[PDB]
Structures are given as C-alpha cells and as structure tokens.
Design a protein around this ligand. Structure first.
Ligand SMILES: *[C@@H]1O[C@H](CO)[C@@H](O[C@@H]2O[C@H](CO)[C@@H](O)[C@H](O)[C@H]2NC(C)=O)[C@H](O)[C@H]1NC(C)=O
Ligand SMILES: *[C@@H]1O[C@H](CO)[C@@H](O)[C@H](O)[C@H]1NC(C)=O
Ligand SMILES: *[C@@H]1O[C@H](CO)[C@@H](O)[C@H](O)[C@H]1NC(C)=O
Ligand SMILES: *[C@@H]1O[C@H](CO)[C@@H](O)[C@H](O)[C@H]1NC(C)=O
Ligand SMILES: *[C@@H]1O[C@H](CO)[C@@H](O)[C@H](O)[C@H]1NC(C)=O
Lengths: 353, 15
C-alpha cells in the first residue's frame, strides 16, 4: 500500500496547528487578542500546508463588537464612522478588515435613514454627509496602507475579492449620497495616501468644460470625461459625477477569469506565481447613478502608470464587472480599447460606465 | 465604474 501524506504540526500566525491528513481543513481558535475560529487547509495530494497560510477571516478585535453595539444604541452614523476610522489606524486582523467594510455598509443605510428624516435641514444634511464621507475615506485609506495588506492576505482569495468589491461599492454609494445633498455648483475633493475621492455637481447649461481627475495630486492615474459626455447626461439641467482612485486595492481584485486578449505566452516570476495581474491603480468614474451601464458616445479616457514595468507585457484596458447581489466579479475588456501603451504607461478609452 | 490595466508576466526570454 503506497504511503499517505500528512502536514506537520506547525505554529503559523500564532495559532498552533496539529499534524493533519492531506486534503483536510482544520479549525482552531483565533490567535490571542482576537475572537473567532481560524482554519488552515492541508493541501490535497501534497500533504503540505496551504502556502497562502491560515484563513483568519473570522478573527476580530474587541473593537468590532464595540462599534456594532454603538449602532444598536442608535448613535449618529457619521459619529460611529469616525470611531471606525480611528480603530482602523492601529493593528488590524483579517476579520477586522471585512468587518470594517461591512460596518461602513450598515452605517450608510443608517445614514440614509437619518437623511430622509431631514427631508437649516439642508445644510445639516450636507454637513452630516461630508462628515460620513471624510470618515469612510479615512477608513479606506487605513485599510489600504502597505502595513495592512498582510491582514487582507490572511483571508482566502474569495473573501479578498468579496471584501474589495464591497469596498468599491460602499464608497461609490456614499459618494452619490453626498451628491444628493449638495447644491450646484459643488466640488468636493478628498486626497489621502491610498485613496482620492471627488464628488462634483454641475450645471450643464451653457459653457461646459471637460472634467479631469484628480486635482491637487501627483497621480499615478488620471481619468477624464468630455464636455459632450457631461452635456449628453444632463438631468434637470445638472450632472452628478463621482471619481475615485485607489492605491493597492488591485491586489485583491482577482484576475481569475479576466477576459484579456494575450498576443503571447504568459509566464511567472517564481514558483506558484501569478501570470496575469492588475498592474495599475484602480480608477473610477460614474455619472448620475451607480452602475448606470450607460453607453458613452465620447468614451471615458484614463491613463495609468504601470506598478511594475519589468518583465510584464500585454497591457489590457479593463473594468471590474461585478454583481451587486453577490459582491463578486471579474475583469472584463468589453467596450474598452487600448489607445496607446509603452513600457511605463497605458492610455485606455472605454465606451461605457 | 472601476477601471484598471491588467498585464501578463513574461514567460519567454531569448538572447
Ligand atoms: C489586449 O492586448 C492585445 C495584445 O496586445 C491587444 O491587441 C493588439 O492591439 C494593438 C493595438 O490596438 C494592435 O495593433 C494589435 O494588432 C493587437 N494584437 C493582437 C495580437 O491582437 C488589445 O488591443 C488589448 N485589448 C485591450 C482592451 O486593451
Ligand atoms: C465569525 O463566525 C461567527 C459564527 O458564524 C459569525 O457570527 C461572525 O459574524 C464571524 N465573524 C466575522 C468577522 O466574519
Ligand atoms: C473562503 O473563506 C470563507 C470564510 O472562511 C469560507 O466560507 C469559504 O468556504 C472559503 N472558500 C474557499 C474557496 O476556500
Ligand atoms: C472561472 O471560470 C470557471 C469556468 O466557468 C468557473 O468554474 C470558475 O468558478 C470561475 N472562477 C471564479 C473565480 O468564479
Ligand atoms: C509612455 O507613455 C506616457 C503616457 O502618455 C508618456 O507620457 C511617456 O512619454 C511615455 N514614455 C516614454 C515614451 O518615454
């Protein structure tokens, strides 16, 4: 009878894991300082531990429940969001990352409720929205700082995608809530180390100028909408536009099933390495409403610096196509076209939002 | 809508 393979007992992520049969998933308590259940997959056939490490996505710090309790006691959403921003400044575990994003979603719904109750009210609504937005922009900045990225990697691939997608979704939704509570003309720009957000509400009457984002920022990415596009999308004489860019988020938006077109062989830079990667920041433009899927006669144009030029090729202009229901997605090239590309930069034109 | 540029890692090296 040929041998069975087993993983060795190992301490990984400060959890002691038992000797385990190949193929088995094992559960153990989350590490000291957190609550929840951790798991670790012993790979089938190999009898080696999953090289990505244990799944700590269920492991949370005490502050997560504290914030959840503030929500129950009916505290103001903007104020709670501010506490969340503070908590994410420090050490955070994988479970804290996804909980933070879920908490921002919950807070957005609470905020929207408070806003409908104020349907001096107008300036109050605006102040409250801006307070919320500043808090979530800070929270996102905290979650994407380089020292927080290892915590994201303590979630499995699917949880990383789900969390990143929820993050993209909640920030955009929050931005459009702000757009509903400012008076034209308005421009609100918030620039941080790992995220920049702009909300602008403009009249389409008379002279309209193209929009270029960001401003006040030495950017690795920029995006623009033509004056005609703005005119063509007028609603009651106004347009509401949301722009966002993110640093490091692309790490988590998996290229599995990406619909890219390769003109050559894709390899890797190491054993078990990736052959297709997001090689730019993620940069977003939306008009009037989230997920409009509107066709643009004048395409949106964006230019990005490559994160690493060396040993990469075959730039493909893409957008994140995701389901609001499942919060999962994939990169699609549909309706996007490469305008120019060299070793260090690519310019793209996409015919839709 | 959220946009980015994907790239492949090289496989083949000559000369
Ligand atoms: C994805 O990459 C492929 C391969 O580079 C691109 O196809 C090339 O595009 C250039 C410029 O339009 C053409 O001159 C070549 O003839 C194409 N090569 C091949 C083999 O098709 C494609 O444009 C990229 N797609 C996107 C959306 O960026
Ligand atoms: C951890 O698991 C418990 C039990 O399923 C669940 O109630 C809790 O929400 C989980 N925590 C996180 C952060 O997913
Ligand atoms: C990813 O993590 C979640 C949470 O632990 C788990 O429910 C799910 O089954 C995992 N998926 C995979 C593909 O391992
Ligand atoms: C990618 O495509 C295959 C084939 O349809 C599918 O089985 C798999 O679940 C997809 N991967 C993801 C991340 O959904
Ligand atoms: C690569 O493209 C960028 C972006 O348009 C351009 O500014 C730069 O000059 C190019 N790099 C070269 C040709 O040295």
């Amino acid at each position: 009878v040929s041998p069975e393979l087993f993983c060795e007992p190992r301490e990984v992520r400060r959890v002691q894991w038992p000797a385990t049969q190949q193929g088995m998933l094992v559960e153990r308590p989350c590490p000291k300082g957190t609550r929840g259940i951790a798991s670790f997959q012993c790979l089938p056939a190999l009898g080696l531990w999953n090289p990505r490490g244990p799944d700590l996505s269920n492991c949370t710090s005490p502050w997560v429940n504290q914030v959840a309790q503030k929500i129950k006691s009916g505290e103001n959403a903007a104020n709670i969001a501010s506490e969340l921003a503070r908590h994410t400044r420090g050490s955070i575990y994988a479970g804290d990352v996804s909980s933070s994003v879920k908490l921002m979603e919950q807070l957005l719904d609470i905020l929207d409720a408070q806003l409908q109750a104020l349907r001096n009210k107008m300036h109050k609504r605006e102040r409250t929205c801006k307070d919320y937005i500043k808090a979530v922009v800070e929270t996102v900045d905290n979650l994407l700082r380089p020292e927080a990225l290892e915590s994201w990697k303590d979630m499995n691939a699917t949880e990383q995608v789900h969390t990143a997608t929820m993050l993209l979704d909640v920030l955009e939704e929050g931005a459009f809530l702000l757009a509903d509570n400012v008076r034209e003309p308005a421009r609100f720009l918030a620039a941080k180390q790992n995220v920049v957000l702009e909300v602008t509400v403009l009249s389409t009457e008379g002279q309209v100028q193209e929009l270029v984002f960001p401003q006040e920022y030495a950017s690795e990415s920029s995006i623009q909408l033509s004056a005609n596009t703005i005119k063509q999308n007028s609603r009651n004489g106004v347009v509401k536009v949301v722009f966002i860019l993110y640093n490091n988020l692309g790490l988590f938006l998996s290229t599995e099933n990406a619909t890219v077109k390769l003109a050559g062989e894709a390899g890797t830079g190491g054993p078990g390495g990736a052959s297709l990667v997001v090689n730019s920041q993620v940069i977003a433009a939306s008009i009037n409403k989230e997920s409009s899927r509107v066709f643009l006669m004048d395409p949106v144009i964006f230019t990005v610096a490559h994160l690493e030029a060396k040993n990469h090729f075959n730039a493909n202009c893409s957008f994140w196509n995701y389901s609001e229901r499942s919060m999962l997605g994939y990169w699609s090239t549909q309706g996007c076209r490469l305008v120019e590309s060299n070793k260090t930069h690519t310019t793209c034109a996409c015919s839709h939002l | 809508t959220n946009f980015a540029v994907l790239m492949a890692h090289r496989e083949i090296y000559h000369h």
